[PDB]
With several copies, the nearest count.
Chain A
Amino acid sequence: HTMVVQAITFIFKSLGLKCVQFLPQVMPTFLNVIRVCDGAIREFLFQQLGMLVSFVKSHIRPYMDEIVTLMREFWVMNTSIQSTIILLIEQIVVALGGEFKLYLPQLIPHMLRVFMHDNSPGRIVSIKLLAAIQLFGANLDDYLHLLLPPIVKLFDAPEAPLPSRKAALETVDRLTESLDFTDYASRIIHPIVRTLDQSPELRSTAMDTLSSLVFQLGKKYQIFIPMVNKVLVRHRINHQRYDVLICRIVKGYTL
């Protein structure tokens, strides 16, 4: 099992984009091999399938539906296979790009279960899934209202460890660059304001996330400025970009 697939991976890498020719042979067998494989090989196959997908890239579209079905079937709360699959998820996103939003809804049930019940030490499988969500990009448009509440609970939970809280905040920063966040301003800002009390360590990261959100909202953020200012003074939060951005918004100058 181990040697056969290591060869095929090196072959596809050595070929380049000419490997696309061999796709119809490899994939149907390779997928059925993942189905009937047992124990350790499963994890290894998923690792090597990721490599395959990274080379095939857009050409993997016909077999993508089966791959998702495979993932859906063999996704378990087992920490080991989750980290493995999350890596394979990140590679599918770069491969399909815009076409990934067709298959994401099948994966959502497992992603929502990851946040609900994550027993990973320090929730590093959650942190990994946050790093994946950053890659999702404009795919998340139609499903952001579903994914966001779990993420919001993550960085507002005090029981949760600080590393996992930083990871959630940095994710919102990235998603702010690409997605629209006007609709869900309140659902986020109120946990953030609350986070600026209970912990001074997140004050830096969180404030950077806020400025990005402010930049995206523009005049729509004016509403919250009174309320947030009250929390900022209470703990002397002095952000350079944020004070500039507020000044720019109130003045009305556009840049």
Chain B
Amino acid sequence: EKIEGSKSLAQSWRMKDRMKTVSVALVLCLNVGVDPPDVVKTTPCARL
């Protein structure tokens, strides 16, 4: 073999940046006790 160093490849594995989810928005349009007019729910329907 030749006395030469092996060329290092472009290691791109490193992460560019670290994101941080600082806050969370829970918008709940549950309308508990009321049924939306568009969908005629069945009598058992889904309650949970």
B40 an interface residue at 8 Å Cβ cutoff?
yes
Would you call the interface of chain B mostly helix, strand, loop, or mixed? loop
B42 an interface residue at 8 Å Cβ cutoff?
yes
B contacts with A, residue count (CB < 8 A): 2
A17 an interface residue at 8 Å Cβ cutoff?
yes
- For B40, list chain A residues within 8 Å (CB): 17-18, 20
Would you call the interface of chain A mostly helix, strand, loop, or mixed? helix
Q: How far in angstroms is the closest Cβ of chain B from A6? A: 25
Question: Contact mask A48-71 → B, CB, 8 Å, 1/0?
Answer: 000000000011000000000000
The A-contacting residues of B in range 1-48, CB under 8 angstroms, are 40, 42
Residue of A nearest to B39 (CB): A17
- For B42, list chain A residues within 8 Å (CB): 20, 58-59
Residue of B nearest to A61 (CB): B42
Q: How far in angstroms is the closest Cβ of chain B from A83? A: 32
Question: Contact mask A7-49 → B, CB, 8 Å, 1/0?
Answer: 0000000000110100000000000000000000000000000
- For A17, list chain B residues within 8 Å (CB): 40
- For A58, list chain B residues within 8 Å (CB): 42
Question: Contact mask A68-85 → B, CB, 8 Å, 1/0?
Answer: 000000000000000000
Residue of A nearest to B40 (CB): A17
Q: How far in angstroms is the closest Cβ of chain B from A9? A: 20
- For A20, list chain B residues within 8 Å (CB): 40, 42
Residue of B nearest to A18 (CB): B40
Residue of A nearest to B42 (CB): A59
Residue of A nearest to B44 (CB): A61
Residue of B nearest to A58 (CB): B42
Q: How far in angstroms is the closest Cβ of chain A from B47? A: 16
Q: List 6 A-B contacts (CB under 8 A).
A: A17-B40, A18-B40, A20-B40, A20-B42, A58-B42, A59-B42
**Residue positions of B touching A, CB distance < 8 A:** 40, 42
**Residue positions of A touching B, CB distance < 8 A:** 17-18, 20, 58-59
Counting from the closest, the 6 A-B pairs by CB-CB distance are A17-B40, A59-B42, A58-B42, A20-B40, A20-B42, A18-B40
